[PDB]
Scaffold this active site. Sequence first.
Site, short mmCIF file in Angstrom:
data_model
loop_
_atom_site.label_atom_id
_atom_site.label_comp_id
_atom_site.label_asym_id
_atom_site.label_seq_id
_atom_site.Cartn_x
_atom_site.Cartn_y
_atom_site.Cartn_z
N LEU A 181 33.54 26.05 72.73
CA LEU A 181 32.09 26.01 72.70
C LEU A 181 31.58 24.73 72.05
CD1 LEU A 181 31.75 29.69 71.51
CD2 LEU A 181 30.98 28.86 73.75
N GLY A 182 32.50 23.90 71.58
CA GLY A 182 32.16 22.66 70.91
C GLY A 182 32.91 22.51 69.61
N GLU A 183 32.95 21.28 69.09
CA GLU A 183 33.65 21.01 67.84
C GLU A 183 32.85 20.05 66.96
OE1 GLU A 183 37.41 19.16 68.63
OE2 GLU A 183 36.56 17.75 70.08
N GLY A 184 32.97 20.22 65.65
CA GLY A 184 32.26 19.38 64.70
C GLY A 184 33.06 19.21 63.43
N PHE A 240 33.39 20.56 60.83
CA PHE A 240 33.98 21.76 60.24
C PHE A 240 34.83 22.52 61.25
CE2 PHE A 240 30.16 20.75 57.90
CZ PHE A 240 30.57 20.85 56.59
N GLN A 264 36.41 23.52 65.22
CA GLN A 264 35.95 23.84 66.56
C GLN A 264 35.65 25.33 66.72
OE1 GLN A 264 39.12 23.74 69.50
NE2 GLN A 264 40.57 22.95 67.97
N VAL A 265 34.65 25.65 67.53
CA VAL A 265 34.31 27.03 67.83
C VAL A 265 34.76 27.38 69.25
CG1 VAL A 265 32.50 28.78 67.79
CG2 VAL A 265 32.29 26.73 66.37
N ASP A 316 21.02 23.34 56.09
CA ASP A 316 20.65 22.67 57.31
C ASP A 316 19.76 23.34 58.32
OD1 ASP A 316 20.22 20.27 58.62
OD2 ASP A 316 21.84 20.54 59.92
N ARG A 338 18.86 24.35 66.05
CA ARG A 338 20.23 24.10 66.50
C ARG A 338 21.21 25.09 65.89
NH1 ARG A 338 24.92 23.43 65.08
NH2 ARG A 338 26.43 21.98 66.03
N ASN A 339 20.91 25.54 64.67
CA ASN A 339 21.79 26.46 63.96
C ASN A 339 21.31 27.90 64.01
OD1 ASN A 339 23.94 24.78 63.10
ND2 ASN A 339 22.66 23.94 61.46
N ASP A 385 26.48 29.25 60.85
CA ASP A 385 26.99 28.19 59.98
C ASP A 385 26.27 28.11 58.63
OD1 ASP A 385 28.71 27.62 62.02
OD2 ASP A 385 27.73 25.75 62.63
C1 LIG Z 1 30.41 34.40 73.14
O1 LIG Z 1 31.72 34.04 72.82
C2 LIG Z 1 29.91 33.45 73.98
N1 LIG Z 1 29.18 32.48 73.49
C3 LIG Z 1 28.66 31.54 74.24
C4 LIG Z 1 28.88 31.54 75.58
C5 LIG Z 1 29.63 32.54 76.14
C6 LIG Z 1 30.16 33.51 75.33
C7 LIG Z 1 30.96 34.54 75.82
N2 LIG Z 1 30.75 34.90 77.21
C8 LIG Z 1 29.72 35.87 77.53
C9 LIG Z 1 29.63 36.22 78.96
N3 LIG Z 1 29.87 35.04 79.74
C10 LIG Z 1 29.63 35.32 81.13
C11 LIG Z 1 31.26 34.74 79.49
C12 LIG Z 1 31.46 34.40 78.19
O2 LIG Z 1 32.34 33.62 77.94
C13 LIG Z 1 28.38 30.58 76.39
C14 LIG Z 1 27.11 30.09 75.89
C15 LIG Z 1 27.29 29.61 74.54
N4 LIG Z 1 27.94 30.58 73.67
C16 LIG Z 1 27.92 30.38 72.35
O3 LIG Z 1 27.32 29.44 71.86
N5 LIG Z 1 28.55 31.26 71.58
C17 LIG Z 1 28.68 31.18 70.27
C18 LIG Z 1 28.76 29.98 69.64
C19 LIG Z 1 28.97 29.95 68.29
N6 LIG Z 1 29.00 28.84 67.69
C20 LIG Z 1 27.76 28.17 67.48
C21 LIG Z 1 28.05 26.71 67.41
O4 LIG Z 1 28.53 26.27 68.63
C22 LIG Z 1 29.61 25.48 68.26
C23 LIG Z 1 29.11 31.08 67.56
C24 LIG Z 1 29.29 31.07 66.21
N7 LIG Z 1 29.41 31.07 65.26
C25 LIG Z 1 29.05 32.26 68.23
N8 LIG Z 1 28.85 32.29 69.59
#
Ligand SMILES: *C(=O)c1nc2c(cc1CN1CCN(C)CC1=O)CCCN2C(=O)Nc1cc(NCCOC)c(C#N)cn1
Length: 299
Positions: A20-23, A25, A27-28, A159, A163-164, A177
């Site tokens: 979902l991205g990395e920073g 702290f 990667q998620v 922060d 965005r958060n 976060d």
């Molecule tokens: C949940 O894991 C999830 N999150 C995000 C997306 C998809 C999914 C899971 N998911 C749901 C159904 N779809 C069809 C398939 C699937 O994989 C995609 C959009 C963005 N998501 C997301 O941001 N999730 C997320 C991000 C987090 N981090 C925030 C910082 O981003 C680096 C955190 C946390 N903490 C929790 N969920």
Amino acid sequence: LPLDPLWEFPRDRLVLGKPLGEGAFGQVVRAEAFGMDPARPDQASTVAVKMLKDNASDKDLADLVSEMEVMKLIGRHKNIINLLGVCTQEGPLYVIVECAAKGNLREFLRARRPPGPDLSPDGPRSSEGPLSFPVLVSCAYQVARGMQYLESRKCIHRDLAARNVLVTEDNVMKIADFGLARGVHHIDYYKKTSNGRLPVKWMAPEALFDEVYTHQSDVWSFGILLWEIFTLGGSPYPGIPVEELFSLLREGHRMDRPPHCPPELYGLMRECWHAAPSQRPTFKQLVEALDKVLLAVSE
Ligand SMILES: *C(=O)c1nc2c(cc1CN1CCN(C)CC1=O)CCCN2C(=O)Nc1cc(NCCOC)c(C#N)cn1
């Protein structure tokens, strides 16, 4: 790392998936969890997994371990990204948290801006954007609710921004976060994130100038978050470079009242941006003030 049976989850019951991205702290990573509810061992659930990169120091480990222990102590609230479990044994450190499938609030708003008049009228509502005013108020209210909880748990999210703030599938706001060791003593006030964000535009004066963070610093940041919400993901202090931001804050400059924004909410913004932190509303006060507005516009 020592075994905590309370939060420990078998890593083999996790199926990691598309990052979902990395920073700074780590990667998620999105993942599926099987039997997150011990009553139903085989049921799948969708979660998020926090971990470290391949290039991580023992400091990065300590930072992620720190964030883990923070989430253990703060407990559950509907409006924050909650800890679900951890993986500390016989493999890399996984910190399992909740998922928010709709992404962060900023992108959520920017993707749902109302159609410009250049689009042709097709349907009885062709000028009716996805976002309405009461919903925008609800988003603000939910963020305030969560922040008030974090404050009661003695947690200072240094922060706080759109965005958060993450959005679940059910359009529920969740603060993310909030337990990072953000390293406040070495902030590059000028560096721009890969997506173009200048984090300094969310900093309270006492934090930016005096390196001081209190719960009232977040109230300031919440005031900026209010601006983001009712501009539908607009960047604060538009067109102002960081150097000019410095002198303008010293003069006491404040953002103008954004278009299509009632005076009730710009009022709350200006209250959050009062110079003296003791004259900004508490998060409890913000919740109550936003509640009255939300109740007014909902029949
Ligand atoms: C949940 O894991 C999830 N999150 C995000 C997306 C998809 C999914 C899971 N998911 C749901 C159904 N779809 C069809 C398939 C699937 O994989 C995609 C959009 C963005 N998501 C997301 O941001 N999730 C997320 C991000 C987090 N981090 C925030 C910082 O981003 C680096 C955190 C946390 N903490 C929790 N969920």
